[PDB]
């Protein structure tokens, strides 16, 4: 959907020419997040509508204050390939868990 | 190991090497062994070879990794090479962690 202003009006339209990018970091080679209890998972009740979270990370830092680090590091997510989606489009992925013990 | 390296169940064997007695001159019967030998000593070249298997870097880093270099201001002699007499310089300890990770 693209968003238009004019003298405070507000519009909202369908575009139908645009994309959307995914996906899936199987090599670990990102920082991982989804393990430490933040919020933005899907919701306990079916109806409800959700916001997605965005990605963020830290990296070192100098004698604990704000200043970097030689060794601290930066990652491009563009740098990664991405399928693209166009509004018939679909995106499906697989998993399979390595042998754990039964809680 | 505290020292650092592998701890092994098998380590590689011990190798022990001794000079055989070879006897001074004797003209008489005696219950009591030989004490006088004739003087000796033994020289000679080793060889040792050994295959070592590697675990290749897969980063997805952007910016560059710090590395070991040779930098020296105004030097004098060349590090890890021989001097004017012939004795071998080591000047600096080396240690085996430049490449970085994310957790």
Redesign the interface.
């Known amino acids: 959907k693209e968003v238009t202003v004019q003298d405070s009006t507000t519009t909202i339209a369908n575009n139908l020419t645009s994309t959307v990018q995914v996906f899936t970091d199987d ?6 997040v989804v393990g430490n209890g933040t919020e933005g998972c899907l919701p306990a009740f079916p109806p409800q509508v959700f916001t997605l979270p965005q990605y963020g990370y830290a990296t070192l830092n100098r004698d604990n204050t704000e200043n970097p680090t ?2 601290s ?4 997510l563009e ?2 390939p991405s399928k693209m989606l166009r509004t018939g489009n679909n995106f499906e992925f697989t998993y399979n868990f390595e042998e754990v013990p039964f809680h | 190991p505290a020292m650092g390296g592998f701890g092994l169940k098998h380590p590689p064997p011990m190798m022990l090497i001794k000079n055989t007695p070879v006897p001074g001159n004797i003209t008489s019967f005696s219950d009591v062994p030989v004490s006088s030998f004739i003087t000796q000593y033994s020289t000679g070249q080793v060889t040792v070879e050994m295959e070592w298997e590697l675990k290749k870097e ?6 560059p990794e ?1 590395q070991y270099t040779n930098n020296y201001n105004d030097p004098q002699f060349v590090d890890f090479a021989p001097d004017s007499t012939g004795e071998y310089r080591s000047t600096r300890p080396i240690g085996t962690r430049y490449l ?1 990770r ?2």
């Open positions: 090599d670990y080679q990102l920082p991982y030689e060794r590091s930066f990652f491009c740098y990664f | 897969n980063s997805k880093r952007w910016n710090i970085t994310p957790l």
